[PDB]
Amino acid sequence: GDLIQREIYLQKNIYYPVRSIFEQGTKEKKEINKKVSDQVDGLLKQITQGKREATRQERVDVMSAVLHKMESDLEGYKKTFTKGPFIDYEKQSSLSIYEAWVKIWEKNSWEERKKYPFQQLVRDELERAVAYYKQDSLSEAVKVLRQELNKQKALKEKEDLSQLERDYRTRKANLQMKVQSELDQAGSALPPLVSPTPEQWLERATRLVTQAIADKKQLQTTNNTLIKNSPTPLEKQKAIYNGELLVDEIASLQARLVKLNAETTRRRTEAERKAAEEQALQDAIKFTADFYKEVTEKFGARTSEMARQLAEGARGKNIRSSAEAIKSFEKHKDALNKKLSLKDRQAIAKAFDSLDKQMMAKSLEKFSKGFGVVGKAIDAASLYQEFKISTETGDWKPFFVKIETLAAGAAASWLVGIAFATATATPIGILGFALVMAVTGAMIDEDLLEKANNLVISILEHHHHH
Ligand SMILES: [Zn+2]
Ligand SMILES: [Zn+2]
Ligand SMILES: [Zn+2]
Ligand SMILES: [Zn+2]
Ligand SMILES: [Zn+2]
Ligand SMILES: [Zn+2]
Ligand SMILES: [Zn+2]
Ligand SMILES: [Zn+2]
C-alpha cells in the first residue's frame, strides 16, 4: 500500500541483497587469478613433493586439468544466468530491478502464480544474480589461465625444437660412419662367400650401395609428402631435417659407388692382362712345337729328333762347367777337325756374321717361356762372335768358358733355347745347326754330345776331294 512500505520492501528485498551479491562478486573477481595461480602451484608442489622443479609437461598437464574444471563451472553458471534476461544489477535502481522481476513473473498464468509466488521468484532471481557475477569472474579467470597455458605450450614446443636441432647436428656429424654401419647391416642378410675373387666382393658391394641409393631416393619422395602434409611445425621440422640427412647419405653413397666402379674397372683390366699372359705362354708352347715341325720340313726327321732329344735331355738339368764340357768335347773332337773342311768352317762363320739380333731375342723369349725358364740377359753378338772364332779356329775352350760365364747356375734348357733361337734368325744350315747342338750338348750331358756328334759326322756326306 503506503509509499513507505514500498520503499522498505524495495530496500529489504531488492537493494540490500543485490548490493551484497555485487560486493561479494567484485571481491571474488579481485582474488580469482591469485587463487587460480595458487591451486596450480600447490598441485604442482604435490606431484614433485618439493624435491625438484616441475617439468614443462607437468605444468601444462596441471594447468589444463584446472582449466577444464573452470570451463565446466563457467558453462554451469552461464547456463543458470541464461535462463532469464540480462540485468546489469550494479547499474540499475532497486525499482528498475523490481519492474524487470515483475515482468518476468507476469509471464505466468494466474494459476501458475498461485503455485509460484512473487517472493519465490525473488529468491530465484537473487540466485541468478550470484550466477551472473560467478560467470563474470570465472570468464576472466579462464582467459588468464588459457593465456598462461598457451604460453607454456609455446615454450615447450620451442624446447622440443631445440632438442630436435641437437639430435640432427649430432646425426649430421656421424654421417660417414653411419653409412658404413647401414651397409654392413644390409650385408648381414647376405649368405657367406667362399674364396671370393676381388671382382666377386666388388660386385656384392656395388649391389648394396646401388640398392641403398634406390631405397633412400624412395624415402625422399615419401618424406617430401610428410613435409607438405605436416600437421604441426615440430613434425615438419622433423621431416625437413630427415630430408637433409637423406641427401647427405645419398651423396656419401654415390661417392662410394664412384670408387667401386673405378676399382672394378682396375680389377677387370688386370684380369684381362693376366689372361693375355696365359695366352702368350700357350703361344710359346705352340711356337716350340711348330719349331720341330719346321725343322723337319727344312732339315729332315733326324735333325728334328736330335733337336727334340736335346730339349728333353736338358729338362731338369743345369749347365755343366767349362772344364767338364772341354773334357767331354776334347774326347770326341779329333774326328771333327779332320772331317770338317775349311769351306765348311767359312760357311758356318759367315752365317753367324749375318745373324739377326732382333728375331733371335724374340725366339729366345718364346723358347724360354715354352721350357719354363726365366728370361735371361745376354749380349748375343758377343756370344756368336766367340762361336764364329771357335768354328774358324779349332779351339772351343774359349767358347765353353764364355758360355759358362754367361750362364753359370742357369738351367740347361736356356742353352737349348739359345741353340734353337739361332736356327730361326740365321742361315746356319743343317751342318751349322748340328754343330751348334753338339756344342750345346757338351754343356748338358755326355750322351747328348755323342748323339749330336754322330749327326754332324753323318751329315758329312760332302764332296771333300781333289
Ligand atoms: Zn555490470
Ligand atoms: Zn641413416
Ligand atoms: Zn678375358
Ligand atoms: Zn713350314
Ligand atoms: Zn763322349
Ligand atoms: Zn763340306
Ligand atoms: Zn764329288
Ligand atoms: Zn786325293
Residue numbers in the entry: 40 to 505
Task: Cite, word for word, the article reporting this structure.
The protein crystallized in the P21 space group, and the structure was solved by a combination of single-wavelength anomalous diffraction and molecular replacement to a resolution of 2.2 Å. The first 39 residues were absent from the final model and presumed to be unstructured; we refer to this below as the “disordered region. Otherwise, continuous electron density was observed for the entirety of the remaining protein sequence (residues 40 to 498). The structure shows that PyoS5 is an elongated, α-helical protein measuring 36 Å on the short axis and 195 Å on the long axis. PyoS5 contains 17 helices, the high preponderance of helical structure likely reflecting the need to forcibly unfold the toxin during transport into a cell and the lower forces known to be required for unfolding helices relative to β-sheets. The C-terminal domain (domain 3, residues 315 to 498) has the canonical 10-helix bundle fold of a pore-forming domain found in colicins, which is consistent with the killing activity of PyoS5 (12). Domain 1 comprises residues 40 to 194, while domain 2 comprises residues 195 to 315. The core structural motif of each domain is a kinked three-helix bundle (kTHB). The other striking feature of the kTHB structural motif is that the third helix from each domain extends into the next domain of the pyocin; helix III of domain 1 extends over 90 Å into domain 2, where it forms helix I, while helix III of domain 2 extends over 90 Å to the pore-forming domain of the toxin. Moreover, over half of the 45 identical residues shared between pyocins S2, SD3, and S5 form a grooved surface that runs perpendicular to the long axis of PyoS5.
